Design a protein around this ligand. Structure first.
Ligand SMILES: CCN1CCC[C@@H]1CNC(=O)c1cc([N+](=O)[O-])c(N(C)C)cc1OC
Ligand SMILES: CCN1CCC[C@@H]1CNC(=O)c1cc([N+](=O)[O-])c(N(C)C)cc1OC
Ligand SMILES: *[C@@H]1O[C@H](CO)[C@@H](O)[C@H](O)[C@H]1NC(C)=O
Ligand SMILES: *[C@@H]1O[C@H](CO)[C@@H](O)[C@H](O)[C@H]1NC(C)=O
Ligand SMILES: *[C@@H]1O[C@H](CO)[C@@H](O)[C@H](O)[C@H]1NC(C)=O
Ligand SMILES: [Cl-]
Lengths: 533, 535
């Protein structure tokens, strides 16, 4: 047997598998348990450390996907299926994966931990876009990704209860982080250099680990791609979490202890079947079971915590894609489809705003419409379409990111900001969606280096550039290549200059102001409105 | 008569006039100055509607400007040309209802289109006798008949106790209307065509023009209209009956005074006493707000200008509207701390917030914040230069630029032929500091053709520029179209439409067409802000 594929961790022995990357071999250790299976009476409960095992544990294949909703909007369409579970569904899903160079690193190597997105209701670390073999082979990185419980199983909460305290899916991540501290050195990883990176909900998670004291000893740097702990969708209050919980109970036929008990007797799919039915308003970019402000994992609201925190020791990399809000429109906004160009009326644009901004009063929705209308072409359907997408993208991602970047920089943190503007040649969504939520990922992970994927040679060169930014940031807290002495360099985001760079096929371009005027509308004015309307 | 110039003797309904032969740079013009069109509104006639002038005996000398209507005199900068040029240049009196007429010399052969000028000055000041309203150039170069009238301003013109008969309000507007009727009856005796009468005015005069469009008994008195940097709609041009009544009884208290007994006491007061307490009745600390302005009485103005503009049919109407580049810059020195003409007026963010409350005095705290957030440059939210220019823009957009855009849009959508401009040329002779750019009222001297007078030190280009503007205004007066029908070599001036929102730049360069009258920012002032304040 290959002694490179044999690792001893604190729970026993593992056997990895040697995988082929276009530039050489990597060692992969897939399906490693970091927790006791959260099944039976362990549903809704905090995770427990995995018990030791005898013999050699087979770690050559991906484990099961955490039980979750499966998207059926466009059946067979590779643009939606690419996010769908590629393994069997099970509540027994608390496993992680490790990629490493072959042979294992001679010296301690910086670690990247990926936390997947999926709106806290879906996702898996086994998806092709999260394949860590390229980063391990090309940049010699140790890459880790875990599964964490999503939906009811991960975030159903009856705050104050002992049997559904909330945020267990976040605790799953933290336990995987502790596992890395205890075990990564056996793979060649440096536990004193751990960078978290995640997209969407994963970025929000990374953000919440920044804001939770127990997590802060488990990593040193953070990357938040198109997601924030602050904002309208990533958290709920104890009252709203409690509300959605007993409503789901009432829907499936079910005192807290008695309520949770009956819920635990329910088959997994019975809970998923009514998952979307507990949202208080008709909406998009809104999810039923997400992290809750419990006063424990989150001592206060993320907004309150980023306003008051000292981030002097922090180094962050944040950013967005060009068209954050485009594909959420086809999931609830009338007039939008991936099968036409989605040219909409004006009445439809006002209607879509009540759905895109479901918490807005009449006056606040009016303010949004009047801000986003191009008064030179106030009824042009093309413009009305592009603005609906902008309303959604800015409200949910771009401005919460700008808000976070601003507070962090102002309060000591070292912040780097980007906007991802390249659209993949292989994208299957229509052109009107441009660069949609989550399509920077396949480039960070280095997928275009696989010739069977049919990317362009320019995209391949682009992917290699991004892997260097991300890995150099992990090594240093600075995404700038210390070998390249060319200028322009990537400058840190500050509250004064507000500098950020654009990521595309052309060399880095430095820009200033991250949707400054429009985000001032969202971050400074709208709160004053709703808190008076 | 017998030994005098036979070409200067004219009879009007009230009697005989002797005018004066005036020298323009390119020839002589006929001037008839100080023609009474009303009985002197003095004594028991203060606050009262004007009665037409009773016929006189003999030949009235019409060679000098008559008295300026009693008004406030600007003392902010004593000796400074920038302020003095607007101050009264004749004696102050309540006996001031006279008009002036300029015609070619000798007088026109065929009936000639008439221009009637209505001066501005916030309804508290102004005179038709000022140098910048000199009609000699238009009359000489374009062969136009020009009429300018004095109208009562301030308390004497607009103090109202709505519903009463001793102070019905809007009498300053009735003076203007009476002068329009005078032109209808008498202008043919000068060679003027009473069937081609175009109104034009600036600031409050523009608002006055707008109110004549909206008042039925005035629509038979003119045919076309030009509105320069002013609208009947907007925050300063009108007050409600309740507010006018409120300001009227307050002024009464401040001087020592049943509506009858109250107005009777006011009439016993010296004119100067009324002027001395005029500014003391405003509800808030403010700029671009005037104590005594037209009132919505349900008579001259059947409803609010905004209501009339929204619901009116304007297929018969042809209007020319526009603004200057920096409408708000000089109102800042009359009440916003941190602003002067003697320094660069670079201000702090704190001064910006304080100035917004003054420039938008009716704004709630929430609305004021909305203004600040819209006009803040979030890339440089503390830059004193930007904050200075933004303060000016707030005052300019709120009071002129957006009411005009609102007016143009509703008129165009409802049948009217609308032409729109922005005036971007700063006079080489301007005495105001550079930071004020092209301030309120500094297109006027170009429309009247003052750069033609070589003794005034304008440049050759400004002289050529002035002639273009006279062409536009006169062509529009003649045809309802500023364009020259016999000039394809020059760029055209397209009408303003809802569909395209076109307007032109007025400067030293040829016409440039642009789209959108500050579309985004005016959506804020005209569409969102009202919704906000009513909550
Ligand atoms: C992060 C979630 N994305 C990433 C890849 C695939 C998935 C796309 N689908 C969505 O984000 C999605 C959204 C909403 N919504 O409210 O926004 C929704 N509703 C209400 C029915 C359903 C959705 O998918 C099934
Ligand atoms: C409106 C009169 N203007 C136009 C042409 C020249 C003349 C200049 N003076 C003004 O615009 C002016 C303004 C204000 N204000 O409210 O903005 C004011 N207040 C409050 C005392 C006094 C003013 O002059 C004495
Ligand atoms: C696109 O398709 C959807 C459903 O297929 C429809 O609701 C929408 O109206 C269509 N848009 C246009 C412009 O036809
Ligand atoms: C200009 O003068 C005014 C009044 O004297 C004063 O308030 C202001 O501070 C001055 N501004 C500057 C930049 O000196
Ligand atoms: C024009 O310039 C001359 C030459 O200096 C000067 O004497 C005269 O006073 C100026 N006239 C005006 C109105 O500025
Ligand atoms: Cl709530």
């Amino acid at each position: 047997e290959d002694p490179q594929l044999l690792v001893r961790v604190r729970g026993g022995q593992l056997r990895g598998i040697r995988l082929k990357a276009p530039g050489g071999p990597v060692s992969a250790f897939l399906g490693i348990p970091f927790a006791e299976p959260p099944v039976g009476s362990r549903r809704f409960m905090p995770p427990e450390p995995k018990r030791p095992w005898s013999g050699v544990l087979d770690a050559t294949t991906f484990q099961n996907v955490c039980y979750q909703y499966v998207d059926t909007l466009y059946p067979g369409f590779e643009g939606t299926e690419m996010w769908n579970p590629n393994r069997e569904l099970s509540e027994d899903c608390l496993y992680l994966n490790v990629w490493t160079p072959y042979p294992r690193p001679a010296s301690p190597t910086p670690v990247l931990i990926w936390i997947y997105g999926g709106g806290f209701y879906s996702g898996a670390a086994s998806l092709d876009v999260y394949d860590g073999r390229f980063l391990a082979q090309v940049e010699g990185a140790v890459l880790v990704s875990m599964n964490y419980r999503v939906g009811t199983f991960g975030f159903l909460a009856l705050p104050g209860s002992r049997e559904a305290p909330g945020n267990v899916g976040l605790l799953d991540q933290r336990l995987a982080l502790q596992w890395v501290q205890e075990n990564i050195a056996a793979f060649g990883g440096d536990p004193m250099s751990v960078t978290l990176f995640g997209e969407s909900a994963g970025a929000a998670s990374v953000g919440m680990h920044i804001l939770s004291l127990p997590s802060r000893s488990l990593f040193h740097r953070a990357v938040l791609q198109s997601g924030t702990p602050n904002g309208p969708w990533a958290t709920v209050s104890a009252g709203e979490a409690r509300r959605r919980a007993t409503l789901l109970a009432r829907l499936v036929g079910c005192n807290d202890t008695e309520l949770i008990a009956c819920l635990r007797t329910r088959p997994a799919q019975d809970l998923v079947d009514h998952e979307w039915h507990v949202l208080p308003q008709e909406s998009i970019f809104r999810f039923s079971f997400v992290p809750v402000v419990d006063g424990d994992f989150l001592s206060d609201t993320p907004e309150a915590l980023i306003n008051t925190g000292d981030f002097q020791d922090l180094q962050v990399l944040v950013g967005v894609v060009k068209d954050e809000g485009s594909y959420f429109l086809v999931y609830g906004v009338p007039g939008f489809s991936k099968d036409n160009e989605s040219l909409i009326s004006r009445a439809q644009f006002l209607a879509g705003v009540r759905i895109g901004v479901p918490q807005a009063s009449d006056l606040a929705a009016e303010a949004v419409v009047l801000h986003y209308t191009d008064w030179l072409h106030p009824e042009d359907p093309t413009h009305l379409r592009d603005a609906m997408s902008a309303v959604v993208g800015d409200h949910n991602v771009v401005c919460p990111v700008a808000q976070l970047a601003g507070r962090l920089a102002a309060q000591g943190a070292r912040v780097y900001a980007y906007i991802f503007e390249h659209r993949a040649s292989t994208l299957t969504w229509p052109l009107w969606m441009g660069v949609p939520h989550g399509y920077e990922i396949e480039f960070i992970f280095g997928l275009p280096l696989d010739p069977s994927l049919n990317y362009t040679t320019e995209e391949r060169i682009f992917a290699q550039r991004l892997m260097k930014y991300w890995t150099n940031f992990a090594r240093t807290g600075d995404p700038n290549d210390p070998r390249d002495s060319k200028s322009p360099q990537w400058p840190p985001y500050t509250t004064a200059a507000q500098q950020y760079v654009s990521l595309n096929l052309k060399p880095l371009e430095v820009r200033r102001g991250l949707r400054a005027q429009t985000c001032a509308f969202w971050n400074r004015f709208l709160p004053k409105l709703l808190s008076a309307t």
